[PDB]
Copies of this chain bind each other. A is one copy, B any other.
């Protein structure tokens, strides 16, 4: 009867997940419980449903999962809940599932923060653009938070383009080059996806458009290197330690039915925890390498 909590991911070796696992382990070391890290080694939906099945089979005390996409993991999550396994989602949600909580970025507010940061860098004036993936809801919320904040709070700034970077570094570089050639006086570009910041940094280096302020997303090594050398002014770090930490805190809590007595009015776990965003600049970039 060893109390073990499992974290399940996709593209499991990415550095992003390491601080999630770190916050999980930090919670476990304070709770004196075991944790284990598993996941699809690749962006393969089938692989993640198979890895998640094996985890449930091992009958863990609870699972914290980041779902590759909102739907294609849901039936397996419910499988775990119906077998009595506490389940919370972190990072990437599956809102249609029986998971008791989601702990992750408020993507709209993240976009708001990028606008506020972009305005800081531009003294609240100038043309700005966005490179995004219109594929997914979470990136559209980042885009919307940025654009709406420009519209409502910085009337001397203008959003001149929202480009489709296709979640790919090369398509993002090409989109950024189109932005810079179409609006040569653009002063800032925000990328809602990691491959976007590298792509537009590569565009800005190729065109020698050294006066453009770049804001990117996430803390991949190649992004942080660009922050370190001044090519990217800031990147937005998701609260991955908070995700792992409060995921375990919530899971540990359900496994001990401390939230299901007679005087609590059902309720159960909080439905959502905003794990926050950190603006990463040259001043704190060193804190974010893996």
Which positions in A face B, CB cutoff 8 Å? Answer: 19, 22-23, 26, 30, 103, 106, 109, 219, 237, 239-242, 245-246, 249, 258-278, 284, 287-288
Interchain nearest-CB distance for A93 vs B (Å) = 12
- Once the chains bind, are B278 and A270 in contact (CB under 8 Å)? no
A23 to B245 alpha-carbon distance, docked (Å): 21
A55 to chain B, nearest CB (A): 25
A216 to B22, CA, bound (A): 43
Closest chain B residue to A102, Cβ basis:
B274
Contacts of A288 in B (CB 8 A): 265-266
Most chain B beta carbons < 10 A, residue from A270, A275, A284: A270
B268 touches A276 (CB 8 A): yes
The answer to whether B263 touches A278 (Cβ under 8 A) is no
**B residues less than 8 Å from A270 (CB atoms):** 103, 239, 242, 246, 273-276
**If A106-B271, A258-B26, A258-B30 touch, does A19 touch B242 (CB 8 Å cutoff)?**
no
Interface pair A267/B241, CB less than 8 Å apart: yes
The number of times this chain is found in the oligomer is 2
Shortest Cβ gap from A192 to chain B (Å): 19
Q: Are B219 and A265 in contact (CB under 8 A)?
A: yes
A10–B282 Cα distance when bound, in Å, is 42
Residue of B at shortest CB range from A26?
Answer: B260
Q: Do residues B276 and A259 form an inter-chain contact, with CB atoms below 8 A? A: no
8 pairs, A vs B, C-beta closer than 8 Å: A22-B264, A241-B267, A242-B259, A249-B249, A265-B288, A268-B276, A269-B276, A271-B277
CB distance from A264 to the nearest CB of B (A): 4
Contact yes or no, A284 B272, CB < 8 A: no
A103 to B271, CA, bound (A): 11
Contact A287 B271 (CB under 8 A): no
- Tell me whether A265 and B249 are in contact in the complex, defined as CB-CB below 8 angstroms, given that A30-B258, A270-B276, A272-B274 are known contacts: no
Closest 4 CB pairs of A and B: A272-B274, A271-B276, A241-B264, A271-B274
Residue numbers in B under 8 Å from A278 (CB-CB): 265-267
Is there contact, CB below 8 Å, between A273 and B273? Answer: yes
Contact of A272 among B22, B219, B273 (CB under 8 A): B273
Measured CB to CB, the closest approach of chain B to A142, in angstroms, equals: 15
With a cutoff of 8 Å between Cβ atoms, the chain B residues found around residue A263 in the complex are 19, 22, 241
Cβ–Cβ < 8 Å partners of A242 in chain B: 259, 267, 269-270
Q: Which residues of B contact A23 (CB under 8 A)?
A: 264, 267
How far apart sit A278 and B266, CA to CA, in the bound complex (Å)? Answer: 7
